[PDB]
Symmetry: C3
Subunit: 33 residues, 3 copies
């Protein structure tokens, strides 16, 4: 169902963005990490 | 191909869940991390 | 739009691969991590 896939992709995109932020934080040692 | 996209989304969802777990582990310092 | 969803999935797949690499690096302590 394309409409439902679209929702899942949109959710994954935000999830991946948030992971990218946390992982760049850990890699760079931002804020005592 | 919607059917193939569906499989890729379903795989990504599990991959993102597993990443979310590991990243929350690293952020929280679970188990000596 | 399936064509656009396909592009987003393909981008997410690479993003998730790269995250998987960085996270396995952090988990394993590769290279001083």
């Amino acid at each position: 169902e394309v409409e439902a896939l679209e929702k899942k992709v949109e959710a994954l995109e935000l999830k991946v963005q948030k992971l990218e932020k946390k992982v760049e934080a850990l890699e760079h040692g931002w804020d005592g990490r």
